Amino acid sequence: MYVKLISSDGHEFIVKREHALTSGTIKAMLSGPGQFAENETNEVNFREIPSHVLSKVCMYFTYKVRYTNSSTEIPEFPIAPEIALELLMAANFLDC
């Protein structure tokens, strides 16, 4: 149910598998034959996404899954100016 995402600086992020499938890149990885055999560690290394960006991406995973089926009101996803460019590049790579 849970998957481990590892940033370039070595931070390990354990998020729900269905949250991580919000990323089209991760969904392509794990929905087909790239799926972890159960002799394998459910780990994905992102050797070029730092942890302060990857943690922000996981917050977006939570936000997207929480508010996708809402029907009356959703809040804005906040993005600080300092991480906007790095987060934009991660969002481009992750297709989400």
Partner: protein
């Protein structure tokens, strides 16, 4: 009513949610299913305040306004090795570069 959390220890960060009315002990059961350590071997902190097993998450301070999906609240996690409990240790995330001047 759900609260959204980052359970953090060393370089591990668990993203999970729980009810504002759920207890600290129930949260340790969630951590047990993930990191395979029973609640007796766990300590949970809000900042530096250790949380008691029987208290609810709302009574500890985790509410909908402070533990949102797009901005989860942080819960510190300390394991116990054999005799005694480790010190609560959480390594911060990396820091972004200084803001480009063309971004004011």
């Amino acid at each position: 009513m759900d609260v959204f959390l980052m359970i953090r220890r060393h370089k591990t960060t668990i993203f999970t949610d729980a009810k504002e009315s759920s207890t600290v002990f129930e949260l340790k059961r969630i951590v047990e299913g993930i990191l395979k350590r029973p609640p007796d071997e766990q300590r949970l902190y809000k900042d530096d305040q250790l949380l008691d097993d029987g208290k609810t998450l709302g009574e500890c301070g985790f509410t909908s306004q402070t533990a949102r999906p797009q901005a989860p609240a942080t819960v510190g996690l300390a394991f116990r090795a054999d005799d005694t409990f480790e010190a609560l240790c959480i390594e911060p995330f990396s820091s972004p570069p200084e803001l480009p001047d063309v971004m004011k």
